[PDB]
Design an enzyme around this catalytic site. Structure first.
Site, PDB file in Angstrom:
ATOM      1  N   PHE A   1       0.789  -1.158  -0.023  1.00  0.00           N
ATOM      2  CA  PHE A   1      -0.190   0.091   0.024  1.00  0.00           C
ATOM      3  C   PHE A   1       0.910   1.220  -0.019  1.00  0.00           C
ATOM      4  O   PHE A   1       0.638   2.241  -0.663  1.00  0.00           O
ATOM      5  CB  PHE A   1      -0.845   0.086   1.306  1.00  0.00           C
TER       6      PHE A   1
ATOM      7  N   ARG B   1      20.005   6.138   2.316  1.00  0.00           N
ATOM      8  CA  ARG B   1      18.864   6.356   3.435  1.00  0.00           C
ATOM      9  C   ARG B   1      17.779   5.508   3.173  1.00  0.00           C
ATOM     10  O   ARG B   1      17.217   5.714   2.038  1.00  0.00           O
ATOM     11  CB  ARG B   1      18.673   7.868   3.667  1.00  0.00           C
TER      12      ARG B   1
ATOM     13  N   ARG C   1       4.805   7.520   1.274  1.00  0.00           N
ATOM     14  CA  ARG C   1       3.387   7.350   1.332  1.00  0.00           C
ATOM     15  C   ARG C   1       2.573   8.489   0.950  1.00  0.00           C
ATOM     16  O   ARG C   1       1.424   8.554   1.253  1.00  0.00           O
ATOM     17  CB  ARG C   1       3.082   7.141   2.938  1.00  0.00           C
TER      18      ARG C   1
ATOM     19  N   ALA D   1      -8.592  15.137   7.599  1.00  0.00           N
ATOM     20  CA  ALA D   1      -7.280  14.818   7.044  1.00  0.00           C
ATOM     21  C   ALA D   1      -7.334  13.799   5.823  1.00  0.00           C
ATOM     22  O   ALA D   1      -8.056  12.635   6.328  1.00  0.00           O
ATOM     23  CB  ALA D   1      -6.007  14.747   7.700  1.00  0.00           C
TER      24      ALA D   1
ATOM     25  N   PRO E   1      11.377  14.312   8.478  1.00  0.00           N
ATOM     26  CA  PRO E   1      12.025  14.077   7.162  1.00  0.00           C
ATOM     27  C   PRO E   1      13.372  13.323   7.366  1.00  0.00           C
ATOM     28  O   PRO E   1      13.932  13.372   6.245  1.00  0.00           O
ATOM     29  CB  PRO E   1      12.214  15.566   6.777  1.00  0.00           C
TER      30      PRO E   1
ATOM     31  N   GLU F   1     -13.943   1.440   3.361  1.00  0.00           N
ATOM     32  CA  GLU F   1     -12.329   1.780   3.519  1.00  0.00           C
ATOM     33  C   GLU F   1     -12.212   1.463   5.125  1.00  0.00           C
ATOM     34  O   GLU F   1     -11.167   1.804   5.649  1.00  0.00           O
ATOM     35  CB  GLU F   1     -12.002   3.041   3.121  1.00  0.00           C
TER      36      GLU F   1
END
Ligand SMILES: Nc1ncnc2c1ncn2[C@@H]1O[C@H](COP(=O)(O)OP(=O)(O)OC[C@H]2O[C@H](O)[C@H](O)[C@@H]2O)[C@@H](O)[C@H]1O
Ligand SMILES: Nc1ncnc2c1ncn2[C@@H]1O[C@H](COP(=O)(O)OP(=O)(O)OC[C@H]2O[C@H](O)[C@H](O)[C@@H]2O)[C@@H](O)[C@H]1O
Ligand SMILES: [Mg+2]
Ligand SMILES: [Mg+2]
Ligand SMILES: [Mg+2]
Ligand SMILES: [Mg+2]
Lengths: 203, 204
Positions: free
Chosen positions: B22, B45, B50, B90, B128, B156
């Protein structure tokens, strides 16, 4: 009144390692109660497992200054003008370590800084729909006149430049989008909301 | 002043997808300029990929109230007393969608909310060092007296409950650690710093 359900209301059936490397990606398989009164079926979610972090906001209450560290974050590349970011001192917490011990070690390795008094800011989940990572932020009392130069552990390919700004300048950089990583935004917004009392406490 | 180096100062030699399901886990391999001069050797790295998200803080400027959405986030389990979190509206941004488009659609799907005006808050990188994810937050004008019930797309497995609280209560829950997900902390701290001007702007 707050949240509705507790750990009594969910069962994690299994977790399956999808990827094992420096970090891991796990499939959580679970069932949980529904707001309508029933139980879900088996749900699966992919979760990025990378441990948890300690974050230090280095604040000089005498000078009203903040110490920032600059380093490349390659993951920022695709959505940012530059992958070099201005950030808070921070590092991963290993087994048996305290948040505050990690914060102090990172402050020395990343900015050459000794830390005096400390207070908790906040502990937050970075992005809990897809990663378990929690980051615990402390504010630490520093002498910003001692913060300067190039730091980081070369043997770990860690190359870090110290920047000192006033608190107001740092917060302006947040508003302008020049600082735009979660840990730094949260810490500097907190500082803008608490600096008067904190400066009084520490002076 | 500001940052020292630009995209010209890094060479991404290759990327490699290590896992794809996914979401994806990618290995970036790169070299970059050093502050003391010269280029680094090759560095790798692992980066969790996503996509990116839009976030909506639903604020009622008439009532000085916020609408929160509650849902399970199983990733919170190991470090939280409960995995059900109080959060902002969101959702992920799909190709060709704007932040505002997604924020308005999710406000309807997740909370049953029509949104009036919107304003940008901030756009941030979640974490990050290990993920590319960026989230762009808007504040959206809502009538909190219309906010109630259970929502989410059951197709979902998305089960969401609406809560209405005062701004002051929501912010106190940030201070107490009862709201502790980055998007909600950032949005509610921003609101605590800007609400007086925002209420004046939106009740004219
Ligand atoms: N980890 C996952 N693994 C598998 N499927 C998933 C996962 N996450 C979502 N889906 C599927 O995708 C659908 C929608 O995902 P939603 O559950 O609404 O999460 P969001 O869209 O609000 O996450 C957005 C942001 O907020 C969060 O904090 C995230 O960390 C982001 O930063 C679900 O119905 C699932 O089928
Ligand atoms: N994605 C990666 N892949 C491989 N090695 C890595 C990676 N990330 C770090 N290392 C190695 O791990 C070492 C340092 O990693 P840590 O202890 O996490 O430092 P930090 O500051 O990055 O993480 C703290 C968080 O603070 C901020 O708030 C950000 O969210 C950060 O993620 C390096 O030598 C690397 O070789
Ligand atoms: Mg670090
Ligand atoms: Mg470090
Ligand atoms: Mg959602
Ligand atoms: Mg949704």
């Amino acid at each position: 009144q707050g949240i509705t359900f507790s750990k009594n209301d969910v069962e994690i059936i299994a977790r399956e390692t999808l990827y094992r490397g420096f970090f891991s990606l796990d499939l959580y398989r679970f069932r949980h109660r529904l707001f309508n009164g029933g139980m879900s079926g088996e749900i699966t979610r992919e979760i990025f497992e990378r441990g948890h972090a300690a974050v230090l906001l280095p604040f000089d209450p005498v000078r009203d200054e903040v110490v920032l560290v600059e380093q490349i974050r390659i993951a920022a590349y695709d959505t940012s003008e530059s992958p070099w970011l201005l950030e808070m001192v921070a590092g991963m917490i290993e087994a048996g370590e305290t948040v505050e011990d990690v914060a102090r070690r990172e402050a020395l390795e990343e900015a050459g800084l000794e830390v005096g008094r400390t207070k908790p800011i906040l502990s937050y989940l970075a992005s809990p729909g897809g990663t378990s990572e929690r980051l615990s932020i402390l504010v630490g009392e520093v002498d910003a006149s001692t913060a300067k130069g190039i730091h980081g552990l070369a043997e770990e390919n860690e190359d870090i430049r110290v920047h000192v700004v006033s608190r107001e300048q740092a917060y302006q950089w947040v508003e302008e989008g020049k600082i735009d990583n979660a840990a730094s935004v949260i810490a500097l917004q907190w500082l803008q909301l608490h600096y008067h009392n904190l400066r009084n406490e520490w002076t």
